[PDB]
Paper text:
We identified two virulence pili independently critical to A. baumannii catheter-associated urinary tract infections, the chaperone-usher pathway pili Abp1 and Abp2.
The structures of the two molecules of Abp1DRBD had a backbone rmsd value of 0.176 Å, demonstrating that they are highly similar. However, while most of the binding pocket was structurally conserved, one region of substantial variation was a 10 amino acid stretch (R86-S95) encompassing the anterior binding pocket loop. Compared to molecule A Abp1DRBD, molecule B’s anterior binding pocket loop was displaced up and into the pocket, moving the α-carbon of S91 by 7.9 Å in the >50 Å long structure. The rmsd value of the backbone of this region was 2.275 Å, indicating that it was substantially distorted from one Abp1DRBD molecule to another. While these two residues are conserved in the Abp1DRBD, they are too far away from each other (>4 Å) (in the crystal structures) to form a salt bridge in both Abp1DRBD molecule A or Abp1DRBD molecule B and the loops are more closed than in the Abp2DRBD structure (especially in molecule B of the Abp1DRBD structure). An R86E variant of Abp1DRBD similarly abolished binding to BSM as measured by enzyme-linked immunosorbent assay (ELISA). Though Abp1D and Abp2DACICU share residues critical for adherence (R86, R102, and Y141), Abp2DRBD has a higher affinity for fibrinogen than Abp1DRBD.
Author numbering: 1 to 167
Write the structure that this text describes.
Amino acid sequence: NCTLSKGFTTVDIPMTIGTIVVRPTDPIGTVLQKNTFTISPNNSTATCNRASDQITAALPLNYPVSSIGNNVYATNIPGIGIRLYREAFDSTDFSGYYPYKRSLTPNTTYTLSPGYFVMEVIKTAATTGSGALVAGRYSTYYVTGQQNRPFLTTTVLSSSPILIASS
């Protein structure tokens, strides 16, 4: 099981993105929009004591994978998928696409690494809808037994909608 440092504090990234225009001529699989957000960690750490303990990168809205697979997940907007990941500032240390699990080394102290959180909005069908992406927590990153206290969350806010405009 995993222990968190005293004063452990989740970092949340509001995902604010301007209007994404989808055109009929955009082929299926097009990355319509790719946004990077700075991951700015604090001194929070986690230490675990069992080799079965895990770090989990999860998508709590629990939408199904889209028709095109490849970790492109459906949204409330037909034909519009999202894909999430993290990377170092120098673009290395690719986290892998959400969701994933990774085994943790017992007695290693883990921190949140700095870098970019990457959100891609991707066309997944010939016909695409219009509207705001549903608001809420789009990703979470937490250790075993500490799902209530993640290292990192990303959130779409009601007050800052991500609008899909299809023409």
